Amino acid sequence: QIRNMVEPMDPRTFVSNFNNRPILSGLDTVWLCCEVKTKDPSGPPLDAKIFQGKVYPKAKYHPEMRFLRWFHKWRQLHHDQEYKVTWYVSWSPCTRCANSVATFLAKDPKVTLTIFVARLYYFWDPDYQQALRILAEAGATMKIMNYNEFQDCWNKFVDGRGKPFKPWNNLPKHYTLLQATLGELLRHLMDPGTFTSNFNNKPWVSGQHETYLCYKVERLHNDTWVPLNQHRGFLRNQLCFLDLIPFWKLDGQQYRVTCFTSWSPCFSCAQEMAKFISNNEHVSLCIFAARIYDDQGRYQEGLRTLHRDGAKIAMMNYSEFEYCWDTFVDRQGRPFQPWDGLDEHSQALSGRLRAILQNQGN
Amino acid sequence: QIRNMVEPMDPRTFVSNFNNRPILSGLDTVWLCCEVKTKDPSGPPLDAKIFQGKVYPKAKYHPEMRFLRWFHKWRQLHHDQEYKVTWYVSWSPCTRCANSVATFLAKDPKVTLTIFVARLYYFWDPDYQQALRILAEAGATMKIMNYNEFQDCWNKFVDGRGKPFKPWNNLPKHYTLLQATLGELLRHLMDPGTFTSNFNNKPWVSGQHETYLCYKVERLHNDTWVPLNQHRGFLRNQLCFLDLIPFWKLDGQQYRVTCFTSWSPCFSCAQEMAKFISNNEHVSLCIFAARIYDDQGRYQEGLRTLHRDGAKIAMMNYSEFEYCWDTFVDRQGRPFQPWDGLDEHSQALSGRLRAILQNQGN
Ligand SMILES: [Zn+2]
Ligand SMILES: [Zn+2]
């Protein structure tokens, strides 16, 4: 019935835009075929729609954002229920729309999203690799379009007047390349040199101009914080990671998010995390910083406001460094090698942070 | 001094043949740049050579085989020592030369081989994916050529009259695609449907026209068989897997190879395994078969000769099926689901096999 719900796309346009040659510079355009269904998979689609946009900036107008706005205005016209949405999209999301869609999914317990992509946009770029990881951690099921998905998108969204889908040569080969790329980037862990150069707690003198943050989530069960090995992650920033964790899909109760950040939060980040833990009493926040970041501004007030709003803030010591090496680093069986003076630098930084957070004088 | 030992290749030829676009149908030819060094990495190369061939059949004349023959006659002209060999090869090995090189490496403790490949040949084909796995398990270090390796092969094997290497557009993007593909196929495990459709022990009535074999290796340490989790594997057939395990790389002394095969060995395979365990007293062989394969010929004599030569032969029961599901299958956390009548079919097959192996009558 999708054929009657949408204005189908020209066959030329489909063959041109959903060709899955990994590298294709010349295709300015993104096409997003979406179908909306109830949670019952047997049921037919309630609605479907084709969105289009350009890949280049003003991502406000990218088909993903158009979908979000349309869907928000669509759900208000039907009774509240649970939805399964499927996308066939010719390019995978940019970084901005990965963040947007991921926060939408993480805050909405009634939506499930499966994204089949024909090609990976900027698959070579660490920012977009991270963006896809963020999408997947928010709960979106990311997949490369295979022959079956191209066939189904032909049958449902393309004006292929009875004519069946005929594949181009190398469709499966492209699928193999792209699916391997997506899998490895989804399972990717931090490079060891990245880790040791960014989490070293000796006084800065080169690099380290970016912030790295690893995080784990635990849930309350029986007066006992029990971990969730499936909801870990690490992010690089050179709006607030708590907005990307789906506190709803997890075992229903209260949670403790433990954070390991190479630099202590900037002012903005501190205020965003404080606002989050204020409006989410079921989430406790623990922050471990490798170094204290002094922005010459209000960073002290930022940390103090974060602390007032319930976050526990400490400096990383050997235990936390070793945990992050063992959990978030592509270590290759090799053990954590502490650098010289780790514990002493950690104790001094702890004293500094103690002075920063202290309210009453003795 | 690799620009004095070899007849360097034309720059045109290098850029044409080492372009790393994954799909390149038109390149008939394989180029293999090899350098031979002592175990000391600081030391300069003792020798170097450029081999060429065609990708298409008569693999006797592929550059890998020409290297093997050249190297065999080269080692006889120098004192016995340990060698580190490096290849820069424009296409990765075919299946036949993967087998040849892998058995050469598995039988020779004094050679180390690193293969950098510009492109993956038939990366989409399960036979070639398995071939690369076989190479890696024999000990070859398989890697995709990156910018640094292209620069090296330019500097060492190409007549680039002082001119430096200048990369083509998309070299890193291609590297990302190819390296992800190589990693995924190197870590690939058996599809769940493949496993249960091929290892089901109820009487044949469809499919199962191929043999699947999973294997683990253990080493003797203080009268206690201790496993080697890094030397497992699984193979599909439509010469003998024992010739591909490097019984020299492992912690020395004696070993026990445990085999789980969907069909019991054909006559040929039984005789090859028997010949192997005869000429390798430090290796014990245990075989577990899911079904008994009756080739209308001498299969009974094959199993009896394998048993006479010291191999332990049994039929798989629940324990072995569950172990293979847990070890060699991409199960995704899902537990082994035994089919109905598994244990009873296993007991009947065990009775049949007992009758086959019985020598003295009671
Ligand atoms: Zn976008
Ligand atoms: Zn070959």
Residue numbers in the entry:
A (entry chain A), B (entry chain B): 4 to 142, 147 to 245, 260 to 383
Tell me what the authors wrote about this structure, in their words.
APOBEC3s (A3s) are an APOBEC subfamily in mammals that restrict viruses, including retroviruses, endogenous retroelements, Hepatitis B virus, and Epstein-Barr virus. The double-domain A3G, A3F, A3D, and single-domain A3H (haplotypes II, V, and VII) are active in restricting HIV-1 through deaminase-dependent and independent modes, with A3G being most potent among them. For the double-domain A3s, the deaminase activity resides only on CD2, but the catalytically inactive CD1 is important for regulating nucleic acid binding, processivity, oligomerization, packaging into HIV virion, and effective anti-HIV activity. In order to understand the structural basis of domain organization and molecular regulation of the complex biological functions of A3G, we determined the double-domain structure of rA3G.
Two fl rA3G mutational constructs (termed FKL and E/Q) yielded well-behaved proteins and crystals in different conditions that diffracted to 2.47 and 2.40 Å, respectively. The E/Q construct was crystallized in different pH and salt conditions but consistently showed the same structure and dimerization via CD1-CD1 interactions, primarily through direct packing of several residues on h6 (K180, L184, A187), loop 1 (I26) and loop 7 (F126, W127) from both subunits. While the FKL structure shows a canonical fold of its CD2 domain, the E/Q structure shows significant alteration in CD2 conformation, with major changes on helix 2 (h2), loop 3, loop 4, and the Zn-active center. The long h2 of the CD2 in the FKL structure has become a short 310 helix (h2′) in the E/Q structure, resulting in a disordered 14-residue stretch spanning parts of loop 3 and h2 (residues A246 to E259). The shift to a short 310 h2 and extended random coil structure is necessary to avoid clashing in this tight packing conformation. However, this also disrupts the conformation of the CD2 Zn-active center within the regions of h2 and loop 3 that become disordered, resulting in no Zn-coordination. When aligning the FKL and E/Q structures via their CD1 domain, the CD2 domain of the E/Q structure shows a rotation of ~29° compared with the CD2 of FKL structure, causing the E/Q CD2 domain to shift ~15 Å downward and ~8 Å toward CD1, and resulting in a much closer packing interaction with CD1. In the E/Q structure, the two domains interact mainly through h3, h4, and h6 of CD1 with h2′, β2, loop 4 and loop 10 of CD2. Additionally, E/Q* carrying individual mutations F126Y, K180S/L184S, or CD2Δloop3 (as in FKL structure) are all active, even though the activity of the FKL* construct (with E259A reverted back to E259) with the combined mutations is less than E/Q* and WT. These results suggest that even though the crystallized E/Q structure, lacking Zn in the CD2 domain, represents a catalytically inactive A3G structural state, reverting the catalytic residue back to E259 can fully restore its deaminase activity comparable to WT.
